[PDB]
Amino acid sequence: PPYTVVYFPVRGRCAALRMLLADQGQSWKEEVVTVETWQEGSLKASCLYGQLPKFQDGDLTLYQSNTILRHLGRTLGLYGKDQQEAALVDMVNDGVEDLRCKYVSLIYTNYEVGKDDYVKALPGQLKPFETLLSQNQGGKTFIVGDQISFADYNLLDLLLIHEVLAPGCLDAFPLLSAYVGRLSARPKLKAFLASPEYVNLPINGNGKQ
Amino acid sequence: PPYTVVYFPVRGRCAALRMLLADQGQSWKEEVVTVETWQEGSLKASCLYGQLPKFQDGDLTLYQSNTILRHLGRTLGLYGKDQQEAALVDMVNDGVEDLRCKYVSLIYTNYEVGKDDYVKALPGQLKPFETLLSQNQGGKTFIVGDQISFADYNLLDLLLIHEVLAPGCLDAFPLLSAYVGRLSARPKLKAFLASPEYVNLPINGNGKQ
Numbered sequence A, B: 001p002p003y004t005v006v007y008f009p010v011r012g013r014c015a016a017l018r019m020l021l022a023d024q025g026q027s028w029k030e031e032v033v034t035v036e037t038w039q040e041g042s043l044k045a046s047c048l049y050g051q052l053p054k055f056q057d058g059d060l061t062l063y064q065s066n067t068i069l070r071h072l073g074r075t076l077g078l079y080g081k082d083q084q085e086a087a088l089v090d091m092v093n094d095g096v097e098d099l100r101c102k103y104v105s106l107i108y109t110n111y112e113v114g115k116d117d118y119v120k121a122l123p124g125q126l127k128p129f130e131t132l133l134s135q136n137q138g139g140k141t142f143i144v145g146d147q148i149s150f151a152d153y154n155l156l157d158l159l160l161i162h163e164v165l166a167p168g169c170l171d172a173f174p175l176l177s178a179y180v181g182r183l184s185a186r187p188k189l190k191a192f193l194a195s196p197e198y199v200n201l202p203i204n205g206n207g208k209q
């Protein structure tokens, strides 16, 4: 497992998986796809769904951001202690994914006019993750069970990008707020989040956040 | 039965998990939610993400259609023979989910105006699945490896509904065509697709398909 991440110079759908790799002490290569390389058409045509990210783990080539996360989850032991927890881990991640889709649609298709409506709906969209925490060790460990899972990284990223979109959207949610604090303070992750590798990438591709 | 499906009276996002359960010889209870019951609001408020399907495996309550699929996939041994195969199964399922989201958006939000453009784009959206079949034992077995996985049931449902949307769409895709006929002829699944519990539900909820 030498790891490669093939993606545009943005945080987007590689942010969570980079946080996970960094926090887990994994080494990886960034293969940075410029607008020129994409436009030439060869790489795109070679991608299974015509999209990035693309990921290489030794001879295994993957596509789909959530597939990469589950693969890393499965192979690094970040997927709950048993089948019951693995199911709850999926349920969290599929929740994160649904909101990310709504986030991305707002960003890339309807930012100015749509933002009011999005932000009005946001407390209701965040509340389920507070609920999950309230029911797992009083919100003191992780989103599921007593160890970190790939869903924590993806939820973390969703929370961070939403604090940028709507400053203080976590204020009503003490468990969520504390959780962001705790996970962000994990020493290797902390270092990664403060690094120009992360800080100097835009969240999205169109200047909007 | 240990399993309960809680859903609207439609095939929709439950059609794949039902085929999976039937094909695997499992019993489950259908609990049907009517629009009136839904509009009352109390069931909706109790749902983690304000949506159906809801699934019960004993006291384990799940939301998210793909979470249900992955959970049954793990529990019933339909998730590849190893970690590399599990990753490829996720890759298929995430591709299936992406096209399902586009399909659902056509059906409920843009059917009249959008159908022609959608059908125009469809071969390009299906071809990745033909590609995967072509690279796995000549398309003669499953989507991944040599045993059925949860992603097969999902992919089958996606193919079935697209043959309803655009009859003959699989004429361009010999391996996908043979694949649909082959899985549909599996004796338990054949009986299930023939049965009233399947046939007497509409694909979607608004009269369009």
Ligand SMILES: N[C@@H](CCC(=O)N[C@@H](CSCCN(CCCl)c1ccc(CCCC(=O)O)cc1)C(=O)NCC(=O)O)C(=O)O
Pocket (backbone or CB within 6 Å): A008, A009, A010, A012, A013, A035, A044, A050, A051, A052, A053, A063, A064, A065, A066, A204, A205, A206, B094, B098
């Ligand atoms: N289900 C998939 C979704 C994958 C997905 O949506 N990928 C898209 C979205 S990726 C991020 C958006 N994007 C592509 C816009 Cl077409 C993009 C973002 C930033 C840059 C670079 C701009 C920054 C800079 O130049 O400084 C270029 C493209 C993609 O590949 N788009 C390109 C294409 O389809 O040809 C998954 O989860 O991986």
Ligand SMILES: N[C@@H](CCC(=O)N[C@@H](CSCCN(CCCl)c1ccc(CCCC(=O)O)cc1)C(=O)NCC(=O)O)C(=O)O
Pocket (backbone or CB within 6 Å): A098, B008, B009, B010, B012, B013, B033, B034, B035, B036, B044, B050, B051, B052, B053, B063, B064, B065, B066, B204, B205, B206
């Ligand atoms: N990420 C989730 C997505 C789940 C999802 O989109 N579910 C929706 C869509 S479910 C299918 C469409 N639908 C609900 C739209 Cl109101 C629906 C379909 C058929 C009927 C038939 C009613 C017949 C009767 O009442 O007798 C009614 C509603 C839902 O629960 N909507 C209700 C709501 O948000 O209030 C997953 O993958 O499971």
Ligand SMILES: [Ca+2]
Pocket (backbone or CB within 6 Å): A029, A030, A031, A032
């Ligand atoms: Ca590089």
Ligand SMILES: [Ca+2]
Pocket (backbone or CB within 6 Å): A076, A077, A078, A079, A147, A148
């Ligand atoms: Ca662990």
Ligand SMILES: [Cl-]
Pocket (backbone or CB within 6 Å): A012, A013, A104
């Ligand atoms: Cl994105």
Ligand SMILES: [Cl-]
Pocket (backbone or CB within 6 Å): B012, B013, B104
């Ligand atoms: Cl649906």
